[PDB]
Amino acid sequence: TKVKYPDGFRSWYHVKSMVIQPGHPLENPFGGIHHVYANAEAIQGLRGGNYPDGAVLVFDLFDYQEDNHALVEGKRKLIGVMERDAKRFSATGGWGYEGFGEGKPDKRLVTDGGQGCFGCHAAQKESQYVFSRLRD
Amino acid sequence: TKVKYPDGFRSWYHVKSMVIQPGHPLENPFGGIHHVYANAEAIQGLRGGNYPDGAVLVFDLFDYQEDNHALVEGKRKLIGVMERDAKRFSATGGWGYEGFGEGKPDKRLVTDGGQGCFGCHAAQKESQYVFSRLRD
Ligand code: HEC
Ligand code: HEC
Ligand SMILES: [Zn+2]
Numbered sequence: 726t727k728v729k730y731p732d733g734f735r736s737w738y739h740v741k742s743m744v745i746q747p748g749h750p751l752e753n754p755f756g757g758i759h760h761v762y763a764n765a766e767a768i769q770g771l772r773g774g775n776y777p778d779g780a781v782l783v784f785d786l787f788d789y790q791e792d793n794h795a796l797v798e799g800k801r802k803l804i805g806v807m808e809r810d811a812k813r814f815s816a817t818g819g820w821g822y823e824g825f826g827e828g829k830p831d832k833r834l835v836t837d838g839g840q841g842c843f844g845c846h847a848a849q850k851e852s853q854y855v856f857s858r859l860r861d
Numbered sequence: 862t863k864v865k866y867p868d869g870f871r872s873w874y875h876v877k878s879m880v881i882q883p884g885h886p887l888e889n890p891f892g893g894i895h896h897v898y899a900n901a902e903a904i905q906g907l908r909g910g911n912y913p914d915g916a917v918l919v920f921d922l923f924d925y926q927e928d929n930h931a932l933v934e935g936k937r938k939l940i941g942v943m944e945r946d947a948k949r950f951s952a953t954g955g956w957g958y959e960g961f962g963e964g965k966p967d968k969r970l971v972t973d974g975g976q977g978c979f980g981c982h983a984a985q986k987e988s989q990y991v992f993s994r995l996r997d
């Protein structure tokens with residue numbers, strides 16, 4: 726029933742990045758520089774193949790500092806994790822949703838079985854609940 | 862004599878990212894969202910080892926569009942490449958410096974054998990000419 730902490734995700738494929746700045750509707754709690762990572766199984770799904778059980782996507786969210794017309798990464802705020810298990814996470818579209826505060830395995834954030842996460846991700850049903858697109 | 866195009870660099874380790882906004886001293890030509898990638902050999906140097914011959918670092922630069930105070934990755938502008946070969950690149954401190962317009966192998970940007978690149982990177986001689994630091 727629990728999403729595994731995605732040990733070693735910093736060695737995984739970098740899918741894409743985005744910066745959410747003050748004034749954006751999602752500044753709270755998604756504000757900062759985020760990086761999306763995918764393990765090999767998730768890469769199969771992002772390429773237009775199917776997502777095998779065991780696919781993991783990670784949303785890696787950093788605070789940032791303004792430094793003379795540069796935005797510089799600061800401390801990690803949190804990670805979001807989607808873990809594919811069609812049977813075990815069938816209540817939330819076959820993905821398990823978990824958050825880890827400061828990316829620490831000891832700071833699990835999700836309290837409602839990931840119904841809140843899935844409420845937003847459900848909009849992407851046609852791409853298996855994944856917003857991110859693979860780019861070059 | 863020429864830096865090899867780093868084929869498959871998008872599958873390499875994501876070191877870090879930074880945004881260089883308009884007004885930054887380096888807006889021309891490095892403005893945009895950049896991601897730094899390291900092959901296995903370059904990771905040896907970033908961890909505190911000597912950079913071995915064959916280490917490659919890539920500066921992957923994207924334009925961005927500001928949309929409701931989100932910075933959204935646009936088209937790739939260029940990649941910058943540092944290729945370690947203590948002997949073949951001795952004139953520029955044992956790194957060969959190249960750029961590829963739009964990340965395309967036939968769009969070589971460096972016209973001065975990398976003396977301008979080396980002139981700035983020489984500030985980091987004590988870190989073997991590399992600015993980026995490994996983060997977790
Ligand atoms: C809308 C308000 C969302 C809620 C609530 C949650 N997420 Fe989300 N997520 C959202 C967007 C718009 C994106 C794409 C970001 C980008 O750069 O394009 C994401 C992405 C993720 C990812 C990466 C995979 C993907 O779908 O692109 C993960 C791993 C992820 N989100 C997890 C996640 C979790 C665990 C949430 C509840 C704690 C959660 N998200 C909520 C939009 C929204
Ligand atoms: C100072 C005026 C610079 C010039 C000219 C060039 N580079 Fe550079 N480079 C600079 C900085 C401050 C950084 C770090 C960015 C960060 O996010 O911290 C970089 C980075 C690179 C990298 C990545 C490895 C590293 O040293 O951090 C590469 C591969 C790189 N630069 C290549 C490069 C090339 C090919 C240049 C001439 C075309 C070049 N740089 C010029 C600063 C400066
Ligand atoms: Zn200014």
Ligand SMILES: [Zn+2]
Pocket residue numbers: 746927930
């Ligand atoms: Zn703005």
